[PDB]
Ligand binder design. Structure first.
Ligand SMILES: [Cl-]
Ligand SMILES: [Zn+2]
Ligand SMILES: [Zn+2]
Ligand SMILES: [Zn+2]
Ligand SMILES: [Zn+2]
Ligand SMILES: [Zn+2]
Ligand SMILES: [Zn+2]
Ligand SMILES: [Zn+2]
Ligand SMILES: [Zn+2]
Length: 378
């Protein structure tokens, strides 16, 4: 039996299997075809992942179906303090806990005394949105500039990372829409229902819909994907979020609209996994080589050039389980209770004979580590 494997490319090259051929064996075959460890490969078919020990018959893989193969190792912390996540592009090259910092938006020093602590994303994302008096001599300094750095290791004061607004530490023990596991962290989709997806699933979701070319062109935004359950008006607008796919898959995303153009005209894409390059032959030509300015292929079947003939829904309970949205403490020194009034973890005690500033979560004296890790609740 012949199925088609899409591996980090939109053309599905063929592989022979029987009914009794296992998934982990199908992987082993594509693994040694492409110089890639099979303990990193993931079989995706009609939006469901196929398990190693399943067979073609267990999978109901008919003749001339199309599977996807994608390189993401499965990675098996729930109780984390942190509130924010950046994408660190060196060294880490992955999603890490963000460390939050503020400075005056004019002089650019750590001298801006904030009118009040932030409590939500818009406070620290939207420009000129919060305020204070800079202490710097002779600085007009009216506006706070919040910036994020990777938390995992030391960072200089200019070595910043982009925030991932959509990503949350899964403190609410919410299950994933696609795979139904309680994983942390998760990406919350900006649909009505706030459907939740784990980072693994997200990866697979993006890379398959990349190979399918089922990405959505929004006139006033570029190319993106909605919430996986097809929720209306849920395109991820904050396009820095497709950086969490790693350089290589992210680089395919940056080429997508360039490639879609080449097809618009009448050209066609090189099928090699790796080279996703666009080419513009004579409309009536059947032979096509990688000329921008590697190999020669057949315009029709997209194999090494030859002669004569060429050879979703999500679950209801999963989707309702996966919605992100579905008092006073004693002052650590004086012991008298205070309420929190918003999202901010910065507390001050109002008894004037103690007046301790403290972290609401930790019950310790307020400090840069709580400031950076969990200034506010999310
Ligand atoms: Cl975040
Ligand atoms: Zn880092
Ligand atoms: Zn200033
Ligand atoms: Zn998942
Ligand atoms: Zn949704
Ligand atoms: Zn090529
Ligand atoms: Zn052909
Ligand atoms: Zn007190
Ligand atoms: Zn704290």
């Amino acid at each position: 039996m012949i199925v088609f494997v899409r591996f980090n490319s939109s053309h599905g090259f063929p592989v022979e299997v029987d009914s009794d051929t296992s998934i982990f064996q199908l992987k082993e075959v594509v693994a040694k075809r492409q110089g890639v460890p099979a303990d990193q490969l993931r079989v995706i078919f009609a939006g469901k992942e196929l398990r190693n020990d399943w067979t073609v018959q267990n999978c109901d893989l008919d003749q001339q179906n199309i599977v996807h193969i994608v390189q993401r190792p499965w990675r098996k912390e729930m109780n984390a303090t942190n509130s924010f996540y950046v994408y660190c592009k060196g060294p880490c090259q992955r999603v890490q806990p963000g460390k939050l910092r503020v400075q005056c938006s004019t002089c650019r020093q750590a001298t801006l005394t904030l009118t009040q602590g932030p409590s939500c994303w818009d406070d620290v994302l939207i420009p000129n949105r919060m305020s204070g008096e800079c202490q710097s001599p002779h600085c007009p300094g009216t506006s706070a500039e919040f910036f994020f750095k990777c938390g995992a290791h030391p960072t200089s004061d200019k070595e910043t990372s982009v925030a991932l607004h959509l990503i949350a530490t899964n403190s609410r023990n919410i299950t994933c829409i696609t795979c139904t596991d309680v994983r942390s962290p998760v990406l919350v989709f900006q649909c009505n229902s706030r459907h939740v997806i784990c980072l693994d699933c997200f990866h697979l979701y993006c890379v398959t819909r990349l190979n399918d070319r089922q990405f959505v062109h929004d006139p006033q935004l570029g190319y993106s994907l909605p919430c996986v359950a097809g929720c209306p008006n849920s395109l991820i607008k904050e396009l820095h979020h497709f950086r969490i796919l790693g350089e290589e898959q992210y680089n395919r995303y940056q080429q997508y609209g360039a490639e879609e153009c080449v097809l618009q005209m009448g050209g066609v894409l090189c099928p090699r996994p790796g080279c996703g390059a666009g080419l513009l032959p004579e409309p009536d030509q059947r032979k096509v080589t990688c000329e921008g300015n590697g190999f020669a292929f057949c315009r029709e079947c997209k194999e090494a050039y030859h002669e004569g003939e060429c050879s979703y829904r999500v679950d209801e309970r999963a989707a309702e389980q996966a919605r992100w949205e579905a008092t006073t403490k004693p002052c650590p020194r004086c012991h008298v209770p205070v309420e929190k009034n918003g999202g901010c973890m910065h507390m001050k005690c109002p008894q004037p004979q103690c007046r301790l500033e403290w972290c609401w979560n930790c019950g310790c004296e307020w400090n840069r580590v709580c400031m950076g890790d969990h200034w506010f609740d999310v």
